[PDB]
Amino acid sequence: GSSGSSGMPPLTLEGIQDRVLYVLKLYDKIDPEKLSVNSHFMKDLGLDSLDQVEIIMAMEDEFGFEIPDIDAEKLMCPQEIVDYIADKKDVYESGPSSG
Asked: What is the 8-class DSSP label of residue 45?
């Protein structure tokens, strides 16, 4: 309870990264202190692929994309994703998007 206020500023890279971390944070398995824009998952964290599919899928949802295992596998850091997002630069582009 106890409501206050919480707006949602424009959409900028600052949001992608934060999200990349935020999402990674949501994962108790992944510690925030250790977590870092430049922090591996298997070299540092030491997670398993089973976690990679998740972490990735997390970004695919948090951003709403379709990252193939061929990519998710190439992604071993949070910054690596940001790049994938930044590129997308908003998903307000035409296309057959159904609910």
From this structure: I
Domain boundaries, the chain: 1-99
Any idea what DSSP says for residue 23? H
Spatial distance between the Cα atoms of 8 and 84, rounded to a whole number of angstroms: 22
CA 50 to the chain's CA centroid: 16
35-57: b (≥16 Cβ within 10 Å) or e? beeebebeeebebeeebbebbbe
Nearest to 51 by CA among 40, 66, 38: 40
Q: Which CATH architecture has domain 1-99?
A: Orthogonal Bundle (1.10)
For the annotated catalytic residues, the residue numbers are 48
